[PDB]
Design a protein around this motif. Structure first.
Motif, PDB file in Angstrom:
ATOM      1  N   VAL D  96       0.850  -1.181   0.000  1.00  0.00           N
ATOM      2  CA  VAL D  96       0.000   0.000   0.000  1.00  0.00           C
ATOM      3  C   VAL D  96       0.889   1.236   0.000  1.00  0.00           C
ATOM      4  O   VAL D  96       1.902   1.285   0.705  1.00  0.00           O
ATOM      5  N   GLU D  97       0.522   2.229  -0.807  1.00  0.00           N
ATOM      6  CA  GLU D  97       1.273   3.472  -0.890  1.00  0.00           C
ATOM      7  C   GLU D  97       0.298   4.632  -0.998  1.00  0.00           C
ATOM      8  O   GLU D  97      -0.873   4.447  -1.324  1.00  0.00           O
ATOM      9  N   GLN D  98       0.783   5.839  -0.725  1.00  0.00           N
ATOM     10  CA  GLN D  98      -0.085   7.007  -0.695  1.00  0.00           C
ATOM     11  C   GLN D  98       0.460   8.103  -1.595  1.00  0.00           C
ATOM     12  O   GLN D  98       1.668   8.346  -1.628  1.00  0.00           O
ATOM     13  N   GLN D  99      -0.431   8.766  -2.331  1.00  0.00           N
ATOM     14  CA  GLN D  99      -0.053   9.940  -3.112  1.00  0.00           C
ATOM     15  C   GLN D  99      -1.183  10.953  -2.986  1.00  0.00           C
ATOM     16  O   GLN D  99      -2.300  10.729  -3.472  1.00  0.00           O
ATOM     17  N   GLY D 100      -0.912  12.035  -2.273  1.00  0.00           N
ATOM     18  CA  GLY D 100      -1.903  13.071  -2.100  1.00  0.00           C
ATOM     19  C   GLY D 100      -3.095  12.609  -1.297  1.00  0.00           C
ATOM     20  O   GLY D 100      -2.965  12.261  -0.120  1.00  0.00           O
ATOM     21  N   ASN D 101      -4.267  12.600  -1.925  1.00  0.00           N
ATOM     22  CA  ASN D 101      -5.503  12.172  -1.285  1.00  0.00           C
ATOM     23  C   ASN D 101      -5.974  10.827  -1.824  1.00  0.00           C
ATOM     24  O   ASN D 101      -7.177  10.541  -1.853  1.00  0.00           O
ATOM     25  N   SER D 102      -5.041   9.981  -2.253  1.00  0.00           N
ATOM     26  CA  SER D 102      -5.439   8.680  -2.747  1.00  0.00           C
ATOM     27  C   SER D 102      -4.396   7.648  -2.364  1.00  0.00           C
ATOM     28  O   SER D 102      -3.235   7.968  -2.102  1.00  0.00           O
ATOM     29  N   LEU D 103      -4.842   6.401  -2.316  1.00  0.00           N
ATOM     30  CA  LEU D 103      -4.001   5.271  -1.968  1.00  0.00           C
ATOM     31  C   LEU D 103      -3.924   4.320  -3.146  1.00  0.00           C
ATOM     32  O   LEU D 103      -4.898   4.144  -3.880  1.00  0.00           O
ATOM     33  N   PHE D 104      -2.761   3.712  -3.324  1.00  0.00           N
ATOM     34  CA  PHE D 104      -2.540   2.730  -4.370  1.00  0.00           C
ATOM     35  C   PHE D 104      -2.252   1.391  -3.721  1.00  0.00           C
ATOM     36  O   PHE D 104      -1.349   1.282  -2.884  1.00  0.00           O
ATOM     37  N   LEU D 105      -3.021   0.384  -4.103  1.00  0.00           N
ATOM     38  CA  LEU D 105      -2.978  -0.929  -3.483  1.00  0.00           C
ATOM     39  C   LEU D 105      -2.481  -1.943  -4.496  1.00  0.00           C
ATOM     40  O   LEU D 105      -3.006  -2.017  -5.612  1.00  0.00           O
ATOM     41  N   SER D 106      -1.474  -2.715  -4.113  1.00  0.00           N
ATOM     42  CA  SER D 106      -1.034  -3.869  -4.882  1.00  0.00           C
ATOM     43  C   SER D 106      -1.501  -5.096  -4.122  1.00  0.00           C
ATOM     44  O   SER D 106      -0.949  -5.419  -3.066  1.00  0.00           O
ATOM     45  N   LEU D 107      -2.524  -5.762  -4.643  1.00  0.00           N
ATOM     46  CA  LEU D 107      -3.177  -6.870  -3.965  1.00  0.00           C
ATOM     47  C   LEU D 107      -3.351  -8.041  -4.909  1.00  0.00           C
ATOM     48  O   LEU D 107      -4.429  -8.623  -5.031  1.00  0.00           O
ATOM     49  N   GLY D 108      -2.284  -8.397  -5.615  1.00  0.00           N
ATOM     50  CA  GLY D 108      -2.262  -9.616  -6.387  1.00  0.00           C
ATOM     51  C   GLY D 108      -3.048  -9.578  -7.671  1.00  0.00           C
ATOM     52  O   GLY D 108      -2.764 -10.368  -8.578  1.00  0.00           O
TER      53      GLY D 108
END
Lengths: 139, 162, 181, 180
Positions: D96-108
């Motif tokens: 999980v990573e964050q950029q500004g007001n959103s999150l990016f999820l790597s979940l397979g």
RNA sequence: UAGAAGCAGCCAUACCUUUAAAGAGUGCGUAAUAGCUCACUGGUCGAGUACUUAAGCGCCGAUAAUGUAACGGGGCUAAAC
């Protein structure tokens, strides 16, 4: 403080550091051979082959304090009354009779491990154990 | 369905009143977290010291003490509190309580010695205080200290003429 | 003493439809006979009867008060519908309050006997005992604890601890009520 | 009814509460929250405290009693201390990573999930496998944590997925547990 | 029985003690324990609660083929009982 608490049963006068003693001693970093030697030294004054209960407290410093309490009351009663195998139907199939004097002597002997404050209470604990084993109470 | 509860509560009140009337000094201990083995050992030590320690319902104990003229702070009954009655060795009971407080989490919440509500500080001081035989020994030692000092000084003065 | 008292009032309806109406009003038709008197027809409060005598036996005795008189009556009969738990008639047999009388009374067995614990055989020879008292003091049932009764022991009739003004009446005093062999 | 409905509401000093025309406004250090209150229940502010009672005793009012007591309490605890619900991402290659007001999820999955964070709510990271949603409204915080969990609900064979930290996942066995 | 340590299974647990209260253990789970929990009892709180019985209305069970189609329709929280 003691890191590990172990409760076991040992053969009095036959304490050896075999597989069972090694498994008991290795988990808590306790010297199984030293514990076996201490158990033999203590149970030399015990009956040979008697299953003495053993409580061992092993601290973090690798030290272990092991105390052999009174042996199993069922074993002692079976030895006294000639009982080797417990009667299955202990409610009806009596395996023997537990004498009043023998029960009093056994209770006095094993009072170290019994938390009673009355000799009658200790004798009653012995008698209840005998009933649970199936030994007919002595009148 | 309520007469049986009334009877059980009455019997408990009677037994507690017998203990409270037989105990010259009393104390309450919060023993939350005191293990089964620790409680058994502490009770055995109290019995050896001649005290009787047991758990008493807070409401029943407060009512019984109010009847018997025990005007203590209800904070002592606040918290699971074993009431220990000691009639002979109050110093011994307090010292045992301090030893349990060192070796465990038990606290001496309230105390009542000669009808005196002993708070935390008074209870701690009483527990650190010794018994009557020890007090007599200490008083004798203090009284003899001047005599020993005088004898030693006289011996040193006599020797100084050697 | 109240718990043995029962309030009634007289009825003059006397019909199947009338009795049904009464029971709808939640009462119980009842009659009282005995002592050579004229039968008395009355009605009882069902809630009161249920509350007080929910466990009535053939030997229960009680007091009827119509506000103006007292009667000592046995519950001779009670017509019960089991499905709806509904009483729908009561027969009260009157007796003289001061005349000694006999009556079989059942026993109630309590405790665990040592003999049966150890291998005794229950044989309840007698399910009841003939006792004697004034009506108001008859025991509903006589208790008997078997705990001290060891093996090979029978219970004598005198051994039955009895209420105060109740007395044995059996011709055979030495017959055994319950044996444990 | 039951004692939660009648238990009084303490007001922290920094927190102000006000009631008017079937509405309640609670203004605190960290924000301001609003609530509707139904006609059958009356809310009073006195002596630096909040009390609730009912004009009627219908069961709807009985339930409303506790409902609005609890809501206003959570409405006051939020404006003073804020609500926070946390999460853990467990599994090989999950990030999980964050950029500004959103999150990016790597979940397979074969796509990397973007996740817009709704306003009024902040997100806090601890490395790349620990999340903590913070906000003024308990309802919103729970909603966000739930929807993130739904992004990849956990599984019982290995604990993989996104779990509530307080949750306990019942666990099964696969191949080797059935060993004879 | 191989293990059965409270929780394959037989028997009772008229087995006692410290007893506050602790059952020959309520369940989960371990070859066997181990381990986690409960009845059980103590403190914080502060009145009804927990199981049932009889009635008055209700809920699910409710489920076929041209078209809503088991109020005559519209609609009705009474305009229902």
């Amino acid at each position: 403080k003691a890191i590990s608490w172990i409760k076991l049963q040992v053969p009095a006068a036959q304490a050896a550091p075999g597989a069972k003693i090694g498994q008991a001693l290795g988990p808590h970093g306790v010297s199984g051979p030293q514990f076996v030697k201490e158990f033999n030294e203590r149970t030399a004054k015990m009956d040979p082959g008697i299953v003495v209960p053993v409580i061992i407290t092993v601290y973090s410093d690798k030290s272990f304090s092991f105390i052999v309490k009174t042996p199993p009351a069922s074993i002692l009663i079976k030895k006294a009354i000639g009982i080797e195998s417990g009667s299955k139907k202990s409610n009806t199939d009596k395996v023997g009779t537990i004498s009043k004097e023998k029960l009093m002597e056994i209770a006095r002997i094993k009072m170290s491990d019994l938390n009673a404050k009355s000799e009658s209470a200790a004798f009653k604990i012995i008698a209840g154990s005998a009933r649970s084993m199936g030994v007919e109470v002595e009148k | 369905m309520s007469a049986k509860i009334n009877a059980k509560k009455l019997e408990m009140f009677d037994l507690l009143k017998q203990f409270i009337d037989s105990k010259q000094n009393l104390f309450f201990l919060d023993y939350r977290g005191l293990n089964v083995a620790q409680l058994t050992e502490l009770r055995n030590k109290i019995e050896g010291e001649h005290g009787s320690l047991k758990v008493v319902k807070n409401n029943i104990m407060k009512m019984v003490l109010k009847e018997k003229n025990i005007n203590v702070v209800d904070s002592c009954l606040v918290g699971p509190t074993v009431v220990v009655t000691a009639l002979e060795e109050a110093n011994v009971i307090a010292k045992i309580f301090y030893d349990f407080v060192k070796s465990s989490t038990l606290k001496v919440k309230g105390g009542f010695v000669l009808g005196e509500f002993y708070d935390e500080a008074k209870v701690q001081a009483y527990s650190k205080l010794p018994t009557k035989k020890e007090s007599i020994s200490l008083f004798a030692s203090v009284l003899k200290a001047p005599v020993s000092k005088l004898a030693r000084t006289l011996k040193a003065l006599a020797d100084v003429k050697n | 003493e109240n718990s043995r008292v029962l309030s009634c009032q007289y009825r003059s309806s006397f019909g199947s439809s009338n009795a049904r109406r009464i029971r709808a009003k939640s009462e119980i038709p009842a009659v009282v006979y005995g002592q050579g008197k004229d039968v008395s027809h009355l009605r009882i409060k069902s809630s009161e009867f249920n509350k007080k005598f929910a466990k009535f036996t053939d030997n229960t005795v009680l007091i009827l008060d119509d506000g103006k008189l007292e009667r000592c009556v046995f519950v001779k009969d009670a017509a019960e519908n089991i499905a709806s738990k509904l009483i729908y008639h009561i027969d009260f047999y009157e007796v003289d309050r001061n005349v000694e009388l006999e009556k079989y009374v059942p026993i109630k067995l309590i405790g665990a006997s040592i003999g049966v614990k150890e291998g005794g055989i229950l044989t309840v020879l007698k399910e009841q005992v003939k006792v004697r008292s004034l009506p108001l003091d008859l025991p509903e049932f006589i208790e008997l604890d078997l705990t001290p009764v060891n093996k090979g022991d029978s219970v004598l009739l005198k051994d039955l601890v009895l209420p105060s003004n109740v007395r044995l009446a059996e011709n055979d005093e030495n017959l055994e009520v319950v044996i444990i062999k | 009814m039951s004692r939660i409905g009648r238990l009084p509401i303490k007001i922290p000093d920094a927190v102000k509460v006000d009631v008017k025309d079937n509405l309640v406004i609670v203004e605190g250090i960290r924000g301001r929250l609003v609530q509707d209150i139904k006609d059958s229940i009356n809310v009073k502010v006195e002596n630096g405290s909040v009390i609730v009672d009912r004009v009627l005793n219908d069961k709807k009012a009985k339930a409303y009693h506790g409902l609005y007591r609890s809501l206003i309490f959570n409405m006051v605890k939020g404006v003073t201390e804020g609500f926070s619900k946390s999460l853990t991402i467990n599994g090989i290659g999950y990030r999980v990573e964050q950029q500004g007001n959103s999150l990016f999820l790597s979940l397979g999955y074969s796509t990397q999930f973007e996740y817009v964070i709704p306003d009024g709510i902040s997100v806090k990271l601890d490395g790349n496998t620990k999340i903590s949603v913070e906000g003024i409204d308990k309802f919103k915080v729970g909603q966000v944590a739930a929807e993130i969990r739904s992004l990849k609900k956990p599984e019982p064979y290995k604990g993989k997925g996104i779990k509530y930290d307080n949750e306990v996942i019942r666990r099964k066995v696969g191949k080797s547990g059935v060993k004879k």
